[PDB]
Design a protein around this nucleic acid. Structure first.
Length: 23
RNA sequence: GGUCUGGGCGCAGCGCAAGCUGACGGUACAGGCC
């Protein structure tokens, strides 16, 4: 995986854990 | 209403050289199934 692919894939886990954390 | 993918090009940090990276840009953009 490239920096973007991971970065892109990460922001999903990122924001998602974001939602859970926030919620 | 939900879910999945990804290429930069940027600012920074380091080296006889050769290279790489930031739960950062970027909750972007570009495209997906009912």
């Amino acid at each position: 995986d490239t920096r973007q692919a991971r970065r892109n894939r990460r922001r999903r886990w990122r924001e998602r854990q974001r939602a859970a954390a926030a919620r």
